[PDB]
């Protein structure tokens, strides 16, 4: 289904590589996701970066391979509760969803695509969107990040 890698406590000891994504929220809505800077210019040495647009909120994510692969068009969406967004079971915890707007076109039947739901923002299977003939989406979910816990 959706690839889910959970951030864990104590992971701050030695990250060799890390990536940065702008942050959008369920309350902020689809508009914020359109507003977020897509191209983050890497003029980096050990990371120095500039963004095409100024953005208030930034999440620092480890260079997990799916997140690293995205590059441009990478965004993180904050959800207060996991259950509403996740088609499957939830742990009643805040959810971070990484989405690639570059692949927003629905081509992957099993692929999950962030879309604007009537209630708010939801992750929808591609096949389901194809059944409703929705050719485009906000972003294609690449990874779901779960919070550190005890």
């Amino acid at each position: 289904r959706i690839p889910v890698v959970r951030l864990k406590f104590g992971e701050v000891a030695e990250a060799t590589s890390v990536v940065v994504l702008p942050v959008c929220k369920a309350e902020e809505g689809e508009k914020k996701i359109l507003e977020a800077p897509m191209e983050i210019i890497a003029g980096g040495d050990f990371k120095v970066v500039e963004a095409e647009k100024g953005w208030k909120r930034w999440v620092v994510l480890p260079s997990w391979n799916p997140v690293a692969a995205i590059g441009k068009g990478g965004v993180a969406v904050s959800f207060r509760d996991d259950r509403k967004v996740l088609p499957w079971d939830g742990k009643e915890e805040p959810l971070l969803v990484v989405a690639d707007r570059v692949r927003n076109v629905v081509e992957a039947d099993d692929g999950y695509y962030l879309v604007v739901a009537e209630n708010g923002l939801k992750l929808e299977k591609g096949s389901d969107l194809k059944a409703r003939e929705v050719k485009e989406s906000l972003g294609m979910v690449v990874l779901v990040v779960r919070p550190p816990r005890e």
Partner: protein, 416 residues
């Protein structure tokens, strides 16, 4: 981890120290990994090891050294096998480390004195063999029935070598049974000694499937008057090696140790046990001779050669010696250079190893006695040249060519 890594600890004179190299898994800090090594290898308040120093490997990414002390009481007196299970038994399988290699061990005097050490050692061996002022020579017979084998031994020893060696893979096989090899070899030795007036021998292989067979073979070699025997310490085991070494002291028989299968555990540089550790372990267990191999990483090689010959070696990281090792007057072990060598390298070998060594050579254009002759001449020429201050690393070409003017055998060798 705070009960194992102690950055401000000074080792005691009676502590055993070990130096490890490791590369920690992703998300694992070096200090935590070091503490774990100490815990896994010891209990895990006076029965635990302590990691006292951690430093990065210069030039190498994600690679660190850790120095761990262990209390004297954690080791059985006189036992190599106990020292090894305690230190390398399961730490290498530890999950937070990608790879682990053991580089060095400091054996405290208090522990060194509980071991026999070499049956005879360097000085005693020269006296027993009555051979002074030079390296010793030998070779391996390339090929046979026991008599034909015996003929080859005779010719090689008769021609001038000090020792002839059994192939390390021949113990007893349907094509040749050890009892006959021992009889025919012994005859060859006795004839050569009688005809030349020197002391000659043969490294009879007594490596065996059981300790009883090992003793039978060793006892037979003693009955036949053989001055030296051979054993494969890594394949056979330390219990068997130690046993044979005690036997050897009691019976006056020199012990030659072959290092077959060492590559299995020390070849790669990022995992396993460095040969110098095994070399120290062997010096404590027993053995008068130990293969070191040739050089013609000479720094690391020379490092362990001193560790197994000298009384006191100061730490020197550039030679791979991590700790100062005081051998407390235990006798040393002659290194044996071997593999890839011929008369062309004789200059280098003499200068590199000095006199306290054995050079084993692998054919000569005119058969075995000329073979032996060419090596004997080349060696004597090199030693005498060294004694006159000639620089064997540069003049070696001329030293051999000049020698070739008086010896047709050497010349035949130098022709190729």
């Amino acid at each position: 981890k705070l009960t194992y890594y102690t950055p401000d600890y000074t080792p005691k004179d009676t502590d055993l120290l070990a130096a490890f190299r490791f590369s920690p898994q992703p998300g694992v800090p070096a200090d935590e990994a070091g503490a774990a090594i100490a815990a896994e290898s010891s209990t895990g308040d006076r029965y635990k090891g302590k990691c006292y120093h951690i430093e990065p490997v210069q030039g190498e990414e994600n690679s660190y050294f850790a120095f761990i002390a262990y209390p004297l009481d954690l080791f059985e007196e006189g036992s190599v096998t106990n020292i090894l299970t305690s230190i390398v038994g399961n730490v290498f399988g530890f999950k937070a480390i990608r790879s682990l290699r053991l580089e060095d061990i400091r054996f405290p005097v208090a522990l060194v004195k509980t071991f026999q050490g070499p049956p005879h050692g360097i000085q005693v061996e020269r006296d027993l063999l009555n051979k002074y002022g030079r390296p010793m020579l030998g070779c391996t017979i390339k090929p046979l029935s026991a008599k034909n084998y015996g003929r080859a031994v005779y010719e090689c020893l008769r021609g001038g070598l000090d020792f002839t060696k059994d192939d390390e893979n021949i113990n007893s096989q349907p094509f040749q049974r050890w009892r006959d090899r021992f009889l025919f070899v012994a005859d060859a030795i006795h004839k050569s000694q009688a005809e030349t007036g020197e002391i000659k021998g043969h490294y009879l292989n007594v490596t065996a499937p059981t300790c009883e067979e090992m003793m039978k073979r060793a006892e037979f070699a003693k009955e036949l008057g053989m001055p030296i025997i051979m054993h494969d310490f890594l394949t056979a085991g330390f219990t068997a090696n130690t046993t044979l070494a005690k036997w050897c002291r009691d019976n006056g028989v020199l012990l030659h140790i072959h290092r077959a299968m060492h590559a299995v555990i020390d070849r790669q540089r990022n995992h396993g046990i460095h040969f110098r550790v095994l070399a120290k372990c062997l010096r404590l267990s027993g053995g008068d001779h130990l293969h070191s191999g040739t050089v013609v990483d000479k720094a690391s090689t020379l490092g362990f050669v001193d560790l197994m010959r000298e009384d006191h070696i100061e730490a020197d990281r550039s030679r791979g010696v991590f700790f100062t090792q005081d051998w407390a007057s235990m006798p040393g072990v002659l290194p044996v250079a071997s593999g890839g060598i011929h008369v062309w390298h004789m200059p280098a070998l003499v200068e590199i190893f000095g006199d306290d060594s054995v050079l084993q050579f692998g054919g000569h254009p005119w058969g075995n006695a000329p073979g032996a002759t060419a090596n004997r001449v080349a060696l004597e020429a090199c030693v005498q040249a060294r004694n006159e201050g000639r620089d064997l690393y540069r003049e070696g070409g001329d030293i051999l060519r000049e020698a070739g003017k008086w010896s047709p055998e050497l010349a035949a060798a130098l022709d190729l």
